Amino acid sequence: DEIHTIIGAGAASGGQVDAANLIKPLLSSGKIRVIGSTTYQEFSNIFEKDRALARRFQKIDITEPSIEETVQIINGLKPKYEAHHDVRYTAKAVRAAVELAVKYINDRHLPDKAID
Amino acid sequence: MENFTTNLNQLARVGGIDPLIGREKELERAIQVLCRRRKNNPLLVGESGVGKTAIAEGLAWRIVQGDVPEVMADCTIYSLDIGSLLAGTKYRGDFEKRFKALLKQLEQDTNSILFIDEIHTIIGAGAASGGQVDAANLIKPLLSSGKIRVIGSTTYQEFSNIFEKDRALARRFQKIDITEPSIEETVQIINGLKPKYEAHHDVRYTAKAVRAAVELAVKYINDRHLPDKAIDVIDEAGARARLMPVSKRKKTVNVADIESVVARIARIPEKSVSQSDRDTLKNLGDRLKMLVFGQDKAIEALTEAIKMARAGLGHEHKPVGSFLFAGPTGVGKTEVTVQLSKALGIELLRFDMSEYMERHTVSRLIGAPPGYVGFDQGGLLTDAVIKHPHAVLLLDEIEKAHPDVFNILLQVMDNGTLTDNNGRKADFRNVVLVMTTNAGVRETERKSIGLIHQDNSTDAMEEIKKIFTPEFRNRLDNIIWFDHLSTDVIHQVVDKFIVELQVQLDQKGVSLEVSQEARNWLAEKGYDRAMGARPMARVIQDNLKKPLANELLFGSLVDGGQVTVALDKEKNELTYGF
Ligand SMILES: Nc1ncnc2c1ncn2[C@H]1O[C@@H](COP(=O)(O)OP(=O)(O)OP(O)(O)=S)[C@H](O)[C@H]1O
Ligand SMILES: Nc1ncnc2c1ncn2[C@@H]1O[C@@H](COP(=O)(O)OP(=O)(O)O)[C@H](O)[C@H]1O
């Protein structure tokens, strides 16, 4: 996870600064399949940085869910939120969290803000 | 945890924590955050001297007092003594077992909240021993699981450097913006703390002294936020009260003692903190008119604008004033600026804008972007102003500057401040901005065609309107147009130049007496409406300095002497023997 964060020094300075160097040849041989995790701007600077990894990983474009999908993820977890807060949300309230957040949250994507 | 954390609720119960003054919404937001199932670790982010830590203590107070909802009431907040834990250094050893014991006690007690002051020690770091790095890794899952809650405290600059750099925390912590309190709240804070200062210094303060410390510090001390600057004024007044009057021992501090410390703390004159320099301002019109001749409307326009600003009519966030000077060459448009700064007793900060024609000016005036050599500078402009908050700032020949300088100028004209590339800011509210330009010097030599000449001059100001766009022009207090010098002015100009010649001659033991006729003669020889006063200097040098130089070096004035000049009927300079 967050593969773009181990590009510096492994978990932290003093650890495997060469973790990437150990991974490059196993990926090349296919010994361990590796699933990466980067962000849109991190990919272009993390994988493109070194061909030994850029030429090993395939890019999958992940985008946000729609208004009704945001409602579905809230509804998926709704029972937990209700249990967690000892509350009940109306169908309208869930839709409003999504429908209104897109007019006010502005900068962060909807899937989390409607949940927040 | 018994020797690593401090029970803040216990401090509130024993009296270690005082009741918080104001900040009701800050405490409510911290509890709103703590009750969330996601992102439930509040972080108090601000500036030094605003109560960030006072608020965290303040929450423990309310938790104990019973001023919070039953969900939070009787929960326990403990601070983390980072120094005590790091002290385990030899090493861990006990560092790790005790940190883990702390986490186990906190994980088991889900009613426990830690308060971590100076959070940047751990977050974005942990480097103090390195032990705080895996300690953070052992905290993160418990924040996530809802077992341990953490209230942090840092500054805006650290926040960006420590929390915005780690996604795990971005998803766990909630920033709360902490600003300074009001004037009244500051007074209440001082009076709450006050006995601790009075007891220390063996002084007592009047109610007025406390109010004055808060208000005068705002007016003149621009380095900090209210709680601490006002407290520092109180403490400084206390410190001088117990120090200065050794033979008198006055025990009560009044507003007068507050004014003396504010003047010193603020780096302003002891008079100016209260009493203005009314006479300095009254005399500007005449002192400047006696140095630069013929520009009477210009001197008055400048003088009046300064007085209005000094009278308090304008905006407190803006510079003292901002004026563009323009006109023909040789007319004193720079000379008057130099004399202004002298007349006011203010140091002149001068930049020649011809030195900033490239795109590499920002890197010098503001400072290089981080990573570049020179990022270490606050910017030549920024640094000059911070060192000299009271200043006359001259940007010579602004039309030669690379256009990016205008963005710098537009910001300052609107907000009175310029930040650096590192976090410091210049305060321009006490400086006078003068920019000069020669756009308006463009002119011709050609006359009309005919037997009778007529004036074919163009309309001045068009040369400015076509260079300086409205965004700039609309933010100036004024544009001062300077005129051409008249022949009466030339006679006055000759006299000041003759005086300068005499000063140089005094250094050699030589007395020069030029007749009035000789002066009228020189005034005529050097008059040129299109070149201002610069030709007068040439005329004097050519007619008087020249023969003096020969005598000073090779002849009769070697040992000093007498020189006079008479005018011939033949229009010759009948210089004197010696
Ligand atoms: N009106 C005046 N009265 C007395 N002295 C003057 C006057 N104007 C200029 N001076 C003197 O001041 C110097 C010339 O000053 P300025 O005209 O201010 O130079 P400047 O500001 O750079 O403008 P230009 O357009 O580049 S020449 C010389 O020493 C003198 O000409
Ligand atoms: N309205 C207020 N009432 C009382 N104290 C305040 C108020 N506002 C700010 N403060 C100050 O807030 C706190 C700032 O310093 P503090 O929180 O103790 O530690 P730190 O220097 O790490 O921020 C002080 O306790 C207190 O002087």
The experimental technique used to determine this model is cryo-EM
B295, B302, B329, B331: residue to mutate for ligand 1 pocket, most atoms within 8 A of CB? B331
Burial class (CB in 10 A: 0-12, 13-18, 19+), B430: middle
**Chain B residues lying within 8 Å of A12, measured CB to CB:** 133
CA distance B536 to B490: 8
DSSP state of B25: H
CATH of the structural domain B487-575, one choice from 1.10.10.10, 3.40.50.170, 1.10.8.60, 1.10.150.300: 1.10.8.60
Which ligand is closest to the CA of B20, given by its number?
Answer: 2
Q: How far is the CA of B152 from the centre of ligand 2 (A)?
A: 15
Residue in this structure with the two tokens 């220390």, named with its chain if needed: B200
* Token couple for B10: 């216990």
Q: Is the distance from the beta carbon of residue B75 to the nearest atom of ligand 1 less than 6 Å?
A: no
Phi and psi at residue B449, in whole multiples of 5°?
Answer: -100, 120
Q: Is the CB of B227 under 6 A from ligand 2?
A: yes
Question: How do the domains of chain B map onto residue ranges?
Answer: 5-177, 183-266, 278-481, 487-575
CA distances in angstroms from A36 to A19, A25, A64, B53, B141, listed in the order given: 14, 16, 19, 41, 22
**Residue A81 and residue B37: Cβ atoms within 8 Å?**
yes
Helix, coil or strand: residue B159: helix
> Is CATH 3.40.50.1820 the classification given to domain B278-481?
no
| Rounded distance from Cα B344 to ligand 1 centre (Å) | 20
**Of B122, B126, B144, B113, which Cα lies nearest the Cα of B37?**
B144
- Residue B157: CB atoms within 10 A of its CB come to 13
Does A14 contact B at CB distance below 8 Å? yes
Q: From residue B141, how far is each of A104, B28, B100, B347 by CA, in Å? A: 31, 25, 13, 59
Number of alpha carbons in the 13 Å side-chain half-sphere of residue B337: 28
Residue owning the nearest CA to atom 13 of ligand 2? B51
Q: Is it true that domain B183-266 has CATH number 3.90.1570.10?
A: no
Dihedral sign of CA atoms B528, B533, B537, B540 in order = positive
Strand partners of residue B562: B511
- Evaluate: CB of B50 within 6 angstroms of ligand 2: yes
Which ligand ends up closest to the CA of B540? 1
What is the Cα–Cα distance from B253 to B242, expressed in whole angstroms?
A: 10
3-state secondary structure B41-108: EEEEEECCCCCHHHHHHHHHHHHHHCCCCCCCCCCEEEEECHHHHHCCCCCCCHHHHHHHHHHHHHHH
What are the phi and psi torsion angles at A78 (to 5°)? -45, -50
**What's the CA gap between B406 and B349, in Å, rounded?**
18
- Neighbouring residues of B90: CB distance < 8 A, sequence distance ≥ 6: none
Provide the shortest C-alpha distance from residue B348 to chain A (in Å).
Answer: 46
Q: In angstroms, rounded to a whole number, what is the distance separating the alpha carbons of residues B382 and B426?
A: 5
Helix (H) or strand (E) run with residue B565 in it:
strand B561-567
Q: Is B146 on the interface with A (CB under 8 A)?
A: no
Contact (CB<8Å) B167/A5: yes
Whole-number Å distance between alpha carbons of B182 and A26: 62
B21 close to ligand 2 (CB < 6 Angstrom): yes
The tokens describing B474, both together, are 């609309």
Interchain proximity A85–B37, CB inside 8 Å: yes
Q: What is the dihedral of CA B221, B222, B225, B226, to 10 degrees?
A: 30
- What is the rounded distance in angstroms from the CA atom of residue B191 to the CA atom of residue B210? 8
Chain B hits for A2, CB-CB cut-off 8 Å, are 167
Q: How far apart are CA B526 and CA B568, in angstroms?
A: 18
Contact indicator for B492, B293 with CB cutoff of 8 Å: yes
Q: How far is B128 from chain A (nearest CA, A)?
A: 14
Place of tokens 């901005």: B433
Residue B505, burial from CB neighbour count under 10 angstroms (0-12, 13-18, 19+): buried
- Supply the DSSP symbol for B225: -
Comparing CB atoms, the residue among B37, B133, B167 nearest residue A2 is B167
Token output for B218: 């705002």
Burial (CB < 10 A; 0-12, 13-18, 19+), residue A50, is middle
> Do residues B435 and B473 lie in contact, with contact meaning Cβ atoms separated by under 8 Å?
no
Q: What is the CA radius of gyration of chain B?
A: 34
Q: Any chain A CB within 8 A of the CB of B167? A: yes
CB B310 within 8 A of CB B275: no
Q: Taking the CA atoms of chain A, what radius of gyration do you get in angstroms?
A: 20
Task: Tell me the CA–centroid distance for residue B3 and ligand 1, in Å.
Answer: 75
Chain A interface includes B192 (CB < 8 A): no
- Do the domains B183-266 and B487-575 sit in the same CATH topology, yes or no? yes
Superfamily of domain B5-177: P-loop containing nucleotide triphosphate hydrolases (3.40.50.300)
B152 CB less than 6 Å from ligand 1? no
From chain A, the residues in CB contact with B167 under 8 A are 2, 5
Residue with tokens 């900068």: A107
Contacts of B39 in chain A (CB under 8 A): 116
